[PDB]
Amino acid sequence: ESINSICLSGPGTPKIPKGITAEAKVKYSFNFKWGGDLPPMSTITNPTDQP
Amino acid sequence: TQMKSQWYFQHNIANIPLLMIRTTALTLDNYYIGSRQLSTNVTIHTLNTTY
Known part of the structure; x- marks a missing residue:
């Protein structure tokens, strides 16, 4: 979660509630x-077939 | 003539006879003589009816 948080500091990364x-x-x-x-x-x- | 060009369920038409063929064995070259031997008369055996 810490390295994801560092990547989220970078541009283009989305906001998801x-x-x-x-x-x-x-x-x-x-x-x-x-x-x-x-x-x-x-x-x-x-x-004996579809009747 | 009773089988029209329409679609039919295969269960309905399964047993309907769509063709009759009649065949008999023949000779053209032995038409009269056939398998005759000696006389034109054939011998028939029978049970005496009178006894």
């Missing part, structure tokens, strides 16, 4: 393609 937590977030979208030979697949009975 006691008991408040400040937060920041980014939304990301990474773009990929997946490549391969054709995969296998499986199926469901018609009678």
